[PDB]
Amino acid sequence: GQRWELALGRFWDYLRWVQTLSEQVQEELLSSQVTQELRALMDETMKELKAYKSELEEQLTPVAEETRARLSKELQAAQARLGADMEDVCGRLVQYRGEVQAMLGQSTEELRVRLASHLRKLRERLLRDADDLQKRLAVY
């Protein structure tokens, strides 16, 4: 129930809504509304995660400078993986917007099927990285 978790939770729900590709989603996907909203959610998540890590560093068990230095950097990488997953989702939503324009009015039904299957794999990856990031944070 950490703050960074609730923020990731909002990003996650929003993305679970995009995954439906309902009428309102498609509408917002052709504008930049979805990627903007996701970008805000993301930024909030990263901010909170950074501040949480900073606080956690206040009550740490002391270890060899090396293991500590190693732990910190493993943590830093897990955080970067999360950010990068989020950007890859938005990137994919950008591509979809362009591919639609590229069709010039033709049916996008097949574009949508393909976007949903890819989006699903990108989300699977994001969830994997968030779970890992949560495990590293817990055993700090």
Swiss-Prot record:
Effect caused by changing residue 127 to A: Increased binding to LDL receptor
Tissue: Produced by several tissues and cell types and mainly found associated with lipid particles in the plasma, the interstitial fluid and lymph. Mainly synthesized by liver hepatocytes. Significant quantities are also produced in brain, mainly by astrocytes and glial cells in the cerebral cortex, but also by neurons in frontal cortex and hippocampus. It is also expressed by cells of the peripheral nervous system. Also expressed by adrenal gland, testis, ovary, skin, kidney, spleen and adipose tissue and macrophages in various tissues.
Glycosylation sites: 53
Impact when changing residue 120 to C: In HLPP3; ApoE3**
Phenotypic consequence of residue 24 to H: Confirmed at protein level
UniProt: heparin binding residues: 122-125
Resulting phenotype, residue 114 to C: In HLPP3; ApoE2-type
Localization annotation: Secreted; Secreted, Extracellular space; Secreted, Extracellular space, Extracellular matrix; Extracellular vesicle
Sequence repeat coordinates: 40-61, 62-83, 84-105, 106-127
Chain segments carrying region LDL and other lipoprotein receptors binding: 118-128
Superkingdom of origin organism: Eukaryota
Post-translational modification summary for this protein: APOE exists as multiple glycosylated and sialylated glycoforms within cells and in plasma. The extent of glycosylation and sialylation are tissue and context specific. Plasma APOE undergoes desialylation and is less glycosylated and sialylated than the cellular form. Glycosylation is not required for proper expression and secretion. O-glycosylated with core 1 or possibly core 8 glycans. Glycated in plasma VLDL of normal subjects, and of hyperglycemic diabetic patients at a higher level (2-3 fold).
Modified residues (Phosphoserine): 107
Pathology linked to this chain's protein: Hyperlipoproteinemia 3: A disorder characterized by the accumulation of intermediate-density lipoprotein particles (IDL or broad-beta-lipoprotein) rich in cholesterol. Clinical features include xanthomas, yellowish lipid deposits in the palmar crease, or less specific on tendons and on elbows. The disorder rarely manifests before the third decade in men. In women, it is usually expressed only after the menopause.
Family classification: Belongs to the apolipoprotein A1/A4/E family.
Role: APOE is an apolipoprotein, a protein associating with lipid particles, that mainly functions in lipoprotein-mediated lipid transport between organs via the plasma and interstitial fluids. APOE is a core component of plasma lipoproteins and is involved in their production, conversion and clearance. Apolipoproteins are amphipathic molecules that interact both with lipids of the lipoprotein particle core and the aqueous environment of the plasma. (Microbial infection) Through its interaction with HCV envelope glycoprotein E2, participates in the attachment of HCV to HSPGs and other receptors (LDLr, VLDLr, and SR-B1) on the cell surface and to the assembly, maturation and infectivity of HCV viral particles. This interaction is probably promoted via the up-regulation of cellular autophagy by the virus.
Misc remark: Binds to and activates LILRB4 on acute myeloid leukemia (AML) cells which leads to suppression of T cell proliferation and promotion of AML cell migration and infiltration.
Name by which UniProt lists this protein: Apolipoprotein E
Species in which this protein is naturally found: Homo sapiens (Human)
